[PDB]
Scaffold this active site. Structure first.
Site, short mmCIF file in Angstrom:
data_model
loop_
_atom_site.label_atom_id
_atom_site.label_comp_id
_atom_site.label_asym_id
_atom_site.label_seq_id
_atom_site.Cartn_x
_atom_site.Cartn_y
_atom_site.Cartn_z
N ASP A 254 0.80 -1.22 0.00
CA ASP A 254 0.00 0.00 0.00
C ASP A 254 0.84 1.28 0.00
O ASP A 254 2.02 1.26 0.38
CB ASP A 254 -0.89 0.02 1.25
CG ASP A 254 -2.14 0.88 1.07
OD1 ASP A 254 -2.19 1.70 0.13
OD2 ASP A 254 -3.08 0.72 1.88
N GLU B 113 2.78 5.34 -3.85
CA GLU B 113 2.91 6.49 -4.76
C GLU B 113 4.33 7.13 -4.78
O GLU B 113 4.84 7.44 -5.85
CB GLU B 113 1.85 7.57 -4.46
CG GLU B 113 0.42 7.21 -4.88
CD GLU B 113 -0.23 6.17 -3.98
OE1 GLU B 113 0.26 5.94 -2.85
OE2 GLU B 113 -1.25 5.58 -4.42
N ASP C 146 -8.32 4.89 -3.06
CA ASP C 146 -9.36 5.34 -2.13
C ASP C 146 -10.45 6.19 -2.78
O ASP C 146 -10.64 7.36 -2.45
CB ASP C 146 -8.72 6.12 -0.97
CG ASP C 146 -7.77 5.26 -0.16
OD1 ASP C 146 -7.92 4.02 -0.21
OD2 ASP C 146 -6.87 5.83 0.50
C1 LIG Z 1 -7.87 12.96 9.14
C2 LIG Z 1 -6.82 12.87 8.04
O1 LIG Z 1 -5.50 12.76 8.57
C3 LIG Z 1 -7.10 11.67 7.15
O2 LIG Z 1 -7.02 10.39 7.79
C4 LIG Z 1 -7.32 9.41 6.76
C5 LIG Z 1 -7.10 8.03 7.30
C6 LIG Z 1 -7.30 6.97 6.24
O3 LIG Z 1 -6.87 5.72 6.80
C7 LIG Z 1 -6.80 4.81 5.70
C8 LIG Z 1 -6.16 3.50 6.15
C9 LIG Z 1 -4.78 3.75 6.79
O4 LIG Z 1 -6.07 2.63 4.99
C10 LIG Z 1 -5.63 8.17 7.69
O5 LIG Z 1 -4.85 8.61 6.52
C11 LIG Z 1 -4.70 7.67 5.44
C12 LIG Z 1 -4.04 8.36 4.25
C13 LIG Z 1 -2.79 9.10 4.69
O6 LIG Z 1 -3.84 7.41 3.17
C14 LIG Z 1 -8.04 7.66 8.46
O7 LIG Z 1 -8.09 8.52 9.59
C15 LIG Z 1 -9.11 8.01 10.47
C16 LIG Z 1 -9.29 8.91 11.70
C17 LIG Z 1 -10.44 8.42 12.57
O8 LIG Z 1 -8.06 8.98 12.43
#
Ligand SMILES: C[C@H](O)COCC(COC[C@@H](C)O)(COC[C@@H](C)O)COC[C@@H](C)O
Ligand SMILES: [Cl-]
Ligand SMILES: [Cl-]
Ligand SMILES: [Cl-]
Ligand SMILES: [Cl-]
Ligand SMILES: [Cl-]
Ligand SMILES: [Cl-]
Ligand SMILES: [Cl-]
Ligand code: NI
Ligand code: NI
Ligand code: NI
Length: 944
Positions: free
Chosen positions: A538, A541, A615
Site C-alpha cells: 500500500d 505512490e 481510495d
Molecule cells: C484525518 C486525516 O489525517 C485523514 O485520515 C485518513 C485516514 C485513512 O486511513 C486509511 C487506512 C490507513 O487505509 C488516515 O490517513 C490515510 C491516508 C494518509 O492514506 C483515516 O483517519 C481516520 C481517523 C479516525 O483517524
C-alpha cells in the site's frame, strides 16, 4: 547541409548539423518495435538505464538501411522508419506503405521548471509532437479518474496519486502504439500544467466589477464574510495539517468543526476562442454551475480530493456566470483552467515530460490492439501468472481488528455457502508505536501463524498489508537508514501521522536493489515465515504525507538512488514491487507470489502485481468513472486491475447515525438503507466483471451478509454474481492464462475488438470482459434500464434470456436492480464449471461448453495447477474449442500439453444457444450433449 549517418548493429545514428538536437538514434527492438532517442548532446550514455524497459536491441531481427537524397529508410519486415536528413524527423509506415505516425518537428527542449531540487545542467523539460490534423483515437495511458476512453483532442496529466496510476503506453486507433520512456510527470495534449482561474480568464465579481470572484463565507447558514478574490485557493497543506492558505479568523473554527460552507459567484471571460478546460479540485461537497446550469456535482472525503473536469467551447469576449457552492468538511479546493493551445497544436498528438536527458520512446506496430499490447509486454516484461485464486472472490476490510474477526468473517462466508478464495488483513496489526517493525500486536494478533493456518484450513488465502513506511524508533528503520536508504526529509518537516498523538515517520528509497533487498529480507523474516500468501503493498505512490503540494512530494524523495524526486515521480511502485517479487522467487522457486499494490508504471506486471484505483468514494459518479479507469489501464498494457467494490469511503450519512457506528446495514438510519444496498448491488455486479473481484472499504462492513439480510433481493443478487464468477472460472482463468502466454488483455475497451466502429471508440460505460462478454454496469441510482450500444459487425445475445439482437444499434437494455445488462457476442464459446466455493475445488472439473451460434468461434481452455511456477516449464494444457456455424459443428480438439495433477479424462457437455431459452443461465440443468473426453478430438453437432 545533410545529417551524417552512422550504421550500427542496432540501427542508425544521425548527427544533425544545426539545432538543439545533435543526435538522433534508431534502435531495432523487434520486428515491430523501434526505439527513437533524440539527444541534445553527443553522449547517449547520459540517458539513465530504463526502469520500464527490460528489453535490449534485437540481434536476430533482419533490417535494411537505404539512403537516398534527403531521406533515410530503415525497415524490418513489419515497420518502415523514414528519417529526414534535413531535420532528423521520423515517420513510420506499416509493411504496406500506410503512414501511422509522423513527427511534426525534432522536439522541444526547454528548462526544467517543476523540480524543487537542484537541476542537472543536461536535464530539460521535453516535448514531442506528432500527427497534426489526425482524426485518430487515442487510448491507454493508465488509470485516470475523469471518464476518458478516447483521449483525442483532450488533456491527460500523467502524474501519480492515490487515485491515479500513470502507464505511459499510448494506443492509437491506427495500427500502432508507443511507449514514452520518461519517469517524470508527463502530459498528453496540453504540455502546460493547468492554471489558476485568473491566469488566462478575465474575472468579474457578483456585481460585474472586474478583478476576481465574490467569495461568501457562511457558518451554518449565517453569512460571516464577503470579499472578492482573484484566486480562491485552499488546495494543500504546507506541513502537518496546516493549510498553505488558512481561512479568515471569522470562519477558521467553522472549517475545523465542519459548519463552514462557501459560495463563489461572478463571471469568467475567455481571452481566446476555442475549447477551454476547467478542473475543480476538491473534497467535501462541491457543485459548479456555468450559465445557470450545474456542470459538476461531486463529493470526496476530506483527505482525498481530486480534479473534476469538463471542457467547454468559449468565444473571446463573452461573459459567463460562474457559481460554486463548497462545503469543505475539513477538505480542500482549487479551481483550475487551461485556455486553448495555439491553432496548429490543437489537433495533434503531444507528449511532454517535466525532466529528462533526451526524448526517448518506442514505436510499436500492431495489426490489432492485442498485437500492440504484446509489444508493450515485450518491452516492459511478461505479465507473469497470478495464482489462480487471485481471480476468485476477495473479501477485505478497513480494517479487521483481530485474528478472530478475520476467521469469523471467512467462516461466515463458508457457512452461507457463498464462494470466496481470499481474505485480507489491512494496516495496524503491529504495536502502535512500531510501524515498520512488522511485529504483530499480541493483544489482537497473538499467533500470526495460527491465523494463517486457520485461513488455510478453510481453503482460503490471506493477504497482508505492508507499507514502505517506518517509524525512526524501529530497528528496521535503523538498518535501512544506516545505508542511506530512508527519505528523512519528512522527519525534518516533523510531519506527524494520524495515529494517536501522531508519529514521526519516513518512507524508504526503493530505487536501488540493495535497498529493496533489505526491505524484502525484513518482511521475509517477520511475516513470510508465518505463511501469508500475498502482499498488499500500500501507499507506494509514495504517499509519505497526504495533501502536501506535489512540489513538496517531489522534494521529500530527494535525494534518491536515481536523482531527484521529480525525476522518478511516477516510478516508485516498480522497483518496490520488484524487490518483493525477486525476494519471493529466491525463497520458493515453485510457488506463484501475489502482490496487490496502489500504484504502478510501465513494467509493473512483470512483478506479479495487480493494481487498484485506490481510495475512491462510495458515489455513483466514482463507480461510473472506474469503467474508463480500468479500460485505460488495460489498454496501457496492464491488465490485472481492480477497485474497492462499493468505494473506499462512504459519506457520513452511511458511516454513522442514530445508533452510532454502522457495522452492519441494520445500524443505518432508515432512510439510507435503500441507496446503500442499491449502490453495493450495482457495484458487486460490476466488480464480478473486472479482472480481480474484490470487496473492500471503510465502515459500513462490506461482506455481502453485512450489506443485506439473507433472502432479500439484494442479498440474493450479490450472491448470484459471486456464484456466477465461479461458474465462469474456466472462462476467466483462461483469460488469466492468456495474460501471460498470449500477452492477453482481460478488460477491453471496445476499440480492441471493434477497431473499425468509430462510434464504439468513445464509449466509456461499456467494455468487453474477455472475448465473449459485453458488460454494461448500471451507474445511476434508481435506474431500471440503460442505453447499451451493441457494436456493429456482430450479433448479440442477451446472456440471461437468449434473445438475439443485431449489432450496430443502441437499445434501452432492461436493467432491474437484480441484474447488470450483459450481452454475449455471437460465435462466443463459453466454458463453465460446476458451482464451487473456491478455485481449487474446480480443478479438473466437468465442463459445460455453451456455443452462441450465428458465427464461427474459437476458444482454447487454459488449465494448469494454478499455484506453482511449473507452467513456466511447459506444465499446462489447452483444450481447443472451435465452432463452425455453417455446419453447426463444435470440435473439441486434441488436448495440447499436460501438467502435474491433470485428469486424463473429463466429462464435457455441449449446448448451443441460438435464441430465447429459459435455461440461458441454468448451467447445471440445461439440456446438453455429454461427451467423455480423453484428450482426443471429438465433434458435437448442433441439434437440428
Ligand atoms: C484525518 C486525516 O489525517 C485523514 O485520515 C485518513 C485516514 C485513512 O486511513 C486509511 C487506512 C490507513 O487505509 C488516515 O490517513 C490515510 C491516508 C494518509 O492514506 C483515516 O483517519 C481516520 C481517523 C479516525 O483517524
Ligand atoms: Cl452441506
Ligand atoms: Cl475444501
Ligand atoms: Cl470448503
Ligand atoms: Cl502450510
Ligand atoms: Cl467446498
Ligand atoms: Cl470442496
Ligand atoms: Cl470442502
Ligand atoms: Ni498453509
Ligand atoms: Ni454525523
Ligand atoms: Ni472446499
Amino acid at each position: 547541409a545533410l545529417a551524417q549517418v552512422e550504421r550500427t548493429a542496432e540501427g542508425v545514428v544521425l548527427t544533425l548539423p544545426e539545432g538543439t538536437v545533435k543526435k538522433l538514434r534508431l534502435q531495432v527492438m523487434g520486428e515491430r518495435i523501434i526505439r527513437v532517442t533524440a539527444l541534445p548532446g553527443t553522449d547517449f550514455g547520459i540517458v539513465p538505464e530504463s526502469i520500464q524497459v527490460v528489453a535490449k536491441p534485437a540481434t536476430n531481427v533482419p533490417f535494411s538501411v537505404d539512403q537516398a537524397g534527403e531521406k533515410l529508410v530503415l525497415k524490418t519486415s513489419q515497420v518502415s522508419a523514414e528519417v529526414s536528413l534535413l531535420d532528423g524527423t521520423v515517420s513510420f509506415r506499416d509493411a504496406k506503405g500506410n503512414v501511422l505516425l509522423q513527427e511534426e518537428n525534432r522536439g522541444t527542449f526547454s528548462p526544467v521548471i517543476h523540480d524543487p531540487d537542484p537541476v542537472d545542467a543536461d536535464s530539460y523539460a521535453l516535448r514531442q509532437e506528432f500527427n497534426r490534423g489526425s482524426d485518430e483515437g487515442f487510448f491507454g495511458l493508465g488509470q485516470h479518474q475523469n471518464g476518458q476512453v478516447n483521449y483525442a483532442g483532450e488533456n491527460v496529466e500523467l502524474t501519480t496519486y492515490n487515485l491515479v496510476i500513470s502507464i505511459p503506453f499510448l494506443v492509437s486507433s491506427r495500427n500502432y502504439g508507443l511507449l514514452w520512456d520518461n519517469n517524470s510527470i508527463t502530459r498528453f495534449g496540453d504540455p502546460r500544467e493547468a492554471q489558476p482561474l485568473n491566469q488566462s480568464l478575465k474575472l468579474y465579481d457578483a456585481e460585474g466589477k472586474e478583478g476576481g470572484l465574490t467569495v461568501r463565507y457562511f457558518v451554518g447558514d449565517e453569512l460571516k464574510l464577503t470579499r472578492v478574490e482573484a484566486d480562491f485557493n485552499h488546495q494543500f497543506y504546507k506541513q502537518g495539517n496546516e493549510l498553505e492558505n488558512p481561512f479568515p479568523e471569522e470562519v477558521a473554527g467553522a472549517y475545523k468543526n465542519n459548519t463552514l460552507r462557501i459560495e463563489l459567484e461572478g463571471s469568467i471571460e475567455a481571452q481566446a476562442t476555442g475549447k477551454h478546460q476547467f478542473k475543480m479540485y476538491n473534497s467535501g461537497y462541491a457543485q459548479l454551475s456555468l450559465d445557470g446550469e450545474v456542470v459538476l456535482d461531486r463529493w470526496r472525503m476530506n483527505w482525498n480530493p481530486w480534479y473534476h473536469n469538463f471542457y467547454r467551447e468559449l468565444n473571446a469576449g463573452d461573459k459567463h456566470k460562474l457559481k460554486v457552492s463548497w462545503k469543505p468538511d475539513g477538505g480542500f479546493f482549487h479551481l483550475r483552467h487551461l485556455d486553448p493551445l495555439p491553432a496548429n497544436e490543437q489537433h495533434e498528438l503531444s507528449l511532454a515530460s517535466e525532466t529528462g536527458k533526451a526524448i526517448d520512446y518506442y514505436f510499436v506496430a500492431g495489426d490489432t490492439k492485442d498485437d500492440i499490447i504484446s509489444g508493450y509486454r515485450q518491452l516492459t516484461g511478461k505479465s507473469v501468472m497470478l495464482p489462480k485464486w487471485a481471480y476468485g472472490f476477495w473479501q477485505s476490510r478497513e480494517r479487521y481488528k483481530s485474528s478472530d474477526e478475520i476467521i469469523q468473517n471467512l467462516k461466515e462466508y463458508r457457512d452461507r455457502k457463498i464462494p470466496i478464495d481470499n481474505i485480507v488483513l489491512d494496516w495496524s496489526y503491529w504495536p502502535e508505536d512500531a510501524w515498520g517493525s512488522h511485529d504483530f500486536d499480541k493483544q489482537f494478533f497473538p499467533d500470526p501463524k495460527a491465523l494463517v493456518d486457520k485461513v488455510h484450513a478453510m481453503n482460503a488465502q490471506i493477504m497482508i498489508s505492508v507499507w514502505p513506511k517506518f517509524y525512526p524508533t524501529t530497528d528496521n528503520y535503523k538498518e535501512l537508514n544506516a545505508k542511506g536508504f530512508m527519505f528523512n526529509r519528512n522527519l525534518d518537516e516533523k510531519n506527524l501521522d494520524w495515529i494517536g498523538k501522531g508519529y514521526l515517520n519516513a518512507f524508504y528509497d526503493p530505487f536501488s536493489p540493495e535497498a529493496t533487498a533489505i526491505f524484502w529480507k525484513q518482511i521475509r523474516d517477520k511475516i513470510n515465515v508465518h505463511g501469508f500468501d500475498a502482499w498488499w503493498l500500500d501507499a507506494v505512490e509514495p504517499d509519505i504525507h497526504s495533501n502536501l503540494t506535489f512540489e513538496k512530494r517531489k522534494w521529500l524523495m530527494t535525494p534518491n538512488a536515481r536523482g531527484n524526486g521529480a525525476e522518478i515521480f511516477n516510478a516508485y511502485a516498480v522497483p518496490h514491487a520488484e524487490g518483493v517479487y525477486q525476494g519471493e522467487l529466491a525463497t520458493d522457486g515453485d510457488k506463484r507470489s501475489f502482490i496487490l499494490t496502489r500504484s504502478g508504471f510501465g513494467g509493473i506486471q512483470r512483478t506479479g502485481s495487480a493494481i487498484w484505483s485506490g481510495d475512491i468514494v462510495s458515489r455513483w459518479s466514482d463507480m461510473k468513472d472506474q469503467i474508463a479507469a480500468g479500460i485505460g489501464t488495460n489498454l496501457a498494457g496492464v491488465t490485472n486491475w481492480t477497485f474497492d467494490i462499493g468505494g473506499f469511503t462512504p459519506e457520513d450519512r452511511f458511516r454513522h447515525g442514530k445508533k452510532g457506528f454502522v457495522g452492519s446495514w441494520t445500524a443505518l438510519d432508515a432512510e439510507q438503507v435503500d441507496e446503500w444496498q442499491e449502490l453495493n448491488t450495482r457495484w458487486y455486479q460490476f466488480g464480478a466483471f473486472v479482472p480481480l473481484y474484490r470487496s473492500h472499504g471503510q465502515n459500513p462492513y462490506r461482506e455481502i451478509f453485512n450489506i443485506a439480510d439473507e433472502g432479500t433481493e439484494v442479498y440474493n443478487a450479490m450472491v448470484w454474481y459471486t456464484k456466477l464468477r465461479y461458474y465462469l472460472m474456466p472462462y476467466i482463468y483462461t483469460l488469466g492464462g492468456d495474460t501471460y502466454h498470449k500477452d492477453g488483455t482481460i478488460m477491453r475497451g471496445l476499440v480492441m475488438d471493434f477497431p473499425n466502429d468509430r462510434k464504439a471508440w468513445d464509449i466509456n460505460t461499456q467494455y468487453m470482459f474477455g472475448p465473449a462478454f459485453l458488460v454494461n454496469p448500471v451507474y445511476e441510482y434508481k435506474a431500471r434500464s440503460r442505453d447499451v450500444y451493441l457494436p456493429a459487425g456482430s450479433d448479440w445475445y442477451n446472456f440471461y434470456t437468449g434473445e438475439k439482437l443485431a449489432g450496430g444499434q443502441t437499445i434501452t437494455a432492461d436493467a432491474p436492480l437484480a441484474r447488470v445488462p450483459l450481452f454475449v457476442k455471437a460465435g462466443a464459446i463459453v466454458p463453465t464449471g460446476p458451482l464451487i466455493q473456491h478455485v481449487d475445488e474446480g480443478l479438473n472439473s466437468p465442463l459445460l461448453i455453451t456455443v452462441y451460434t450465428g458465427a464461427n468461434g474459437s476458444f482454447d481452455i487454459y488449465e494448469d495447477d494454478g499455484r506453482s511456477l511449473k507452467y513456466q516449464q511447459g506444465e499446462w494444457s489447452r483444450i481447443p474449442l472451435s465452432y463452425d456455424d455453417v455446419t453447426g459443428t463444435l470440435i473439441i480438439g486434441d488436448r495440447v500439453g499436460s501438467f502435474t495433477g491433470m485428469a486424463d479424462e473429463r466429462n464435457i457437455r455441449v449446448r448451443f444457444i441460438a435464441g430465447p431459452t429459459a435455461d440461458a443461465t441454468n448451467f447445471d440443468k440445461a439440456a446438453a450433449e455429454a461427451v467423455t473426453y480423453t484428450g482426443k478430438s471429438v465433434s458435437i453437432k448442433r441439434p437440428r
